[PDB]
A paper describes a structure:
HP1α contains two folded domains, chromodomain (CD) and chromoshadow domain (CSD), which are linked by a hinge region and flanked by the amino-terminal and carboxyl-terminal extensions (nte and cte). CD binds to tri/di methylated lysine 9 of histone H3 (H3K9me3/2), a major epigenetic modification and a hallmark of heterochromatin, whereas CSD mediates dimerization and associates with various proteins through recognizing the PxVxL motif, also known as the HP1 box. In addition to supporting the establishment of H3K9me3 as a recruitment module for HP1, KAP1 contains a HP1 box (KAP1Hbox) sequence, which is recognized by the CSD of HP1α (HP1αCSD) in biochemical studies. Each HP1αCSD protomer folds into a short N-terminal helix α1, a central three-stranded antiparallel β-sheet, and two C-terminal helices α2 and α3.
The formation of a tight HP1αCSD-KAP1 complex was confirmed by measuring binding affinity of HP1αCSD to the HP1 box-containing KAP1 (KAP1Hbox) peptide (aa 483–493 of KAP1) using fluorescence spectroscopy. To characterize the binding mechanism at atomic-resolution level, we co-expressed HP1αCSD and a larger fragment of KAP1 (aa 468–496, KAP1Hbox’), purified the HP1αCSD-KAP1Hbox’ complex, crystallized it, and determined its structure by X-ray crystallography. In the crystal structure, HP1αCSD forms a homodimer (HP1αCSD1 and HP1αCSD2, colored pink and grey, respectively), also observed in the structures of CSDs of HP1β and HP1γ10,11. The KAP1Hbox’ is bound in an extended conformation in an elongated groove created by the C-terminal regions following α3 of HP1αCSD. These regions of HP1αCSD adopt a β-strand conformation and sandwich KAP1Hbox’, essentially forming a triple stranded β-sheet, with KAP1Hbox’ being oriented parallel to the HP1αCSD1 region and antiparallel to the HP1αCSD2 region. A set of hydrophobic interactions and hydrogen bonds stabilize the HP1αCSD-KAP1Hbox’ complex. The side chains of Pro486, Val488 and Leu490 of KAP1Hbox’ are oriented toward and buried in the hydrophobic groove of the HP1αCSD dimer. Characteristic intermolecular β-sheet hydrogen bonds are formed between the backbone amides of Arg487 and Ser489 of KAP1Hbox’ and backbone carbonyl groups of Thr173 and Arg171 of HP1αCSD2. R487 is located in the middle of the β-strand in the HP1αCSD-KAP1Hbox’ complex and therefore is highly restrained with its positively charged side chain being fully accessible for DNA binding. Interestingly, incorporating additional symmetry mates from the crystal lattice showed that the HP1αCSD-KAP1Hbox’ complex crystallizes in an oligomeric spiral form with a diameter of ~66 Å and the vertical step of ~67 Å, large enough to potentially wrap around two double-stranded strands of DNA. The positively charged side chain of R487 is oriented toward the inner side of the spiral and therefore may augment binding to DNA.
Numbering used by the authors:
A (entry chain E): 485 to 490
B (entry chain A), C (entry chain C): 111 to 174
The structure:
Amino acid sequence: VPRVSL
Amino acid sequence: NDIARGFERGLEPEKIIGATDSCGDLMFLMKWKDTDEADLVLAKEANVKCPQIVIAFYEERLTW
Amino acid sequence: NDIARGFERGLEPEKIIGATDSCGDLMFLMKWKDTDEADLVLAKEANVKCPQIVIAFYEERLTW
């Protein structure tokens, strides 16, 4: 499950 | 890829419903318009063909 | 979502090269005979259509 971490 | 060929179906992309890098190159599972069908497409190709759909997907899952 | 329809291509299964439960039902990525290509098929359907290929896959993954 992707999650773009900024 | 050997695997992602969803755009060869010639249907209108509607929404990305998942993603994987498990075959090296990033893929998306693309749901098409007015069907429950989805297929894997290369991310590189979706970036070009449906950039707003790609972005909407990245935007929906921003974490800090 | 109707995702795994690999068998509809009417091609001959050769080897399962991966598997996922991430879209609900267990799926296999099936490599076909005489091609570089591959596509998701549902496990329940591979069990019936190509049981030795299913078994061969599970065999090379045995851990103790």
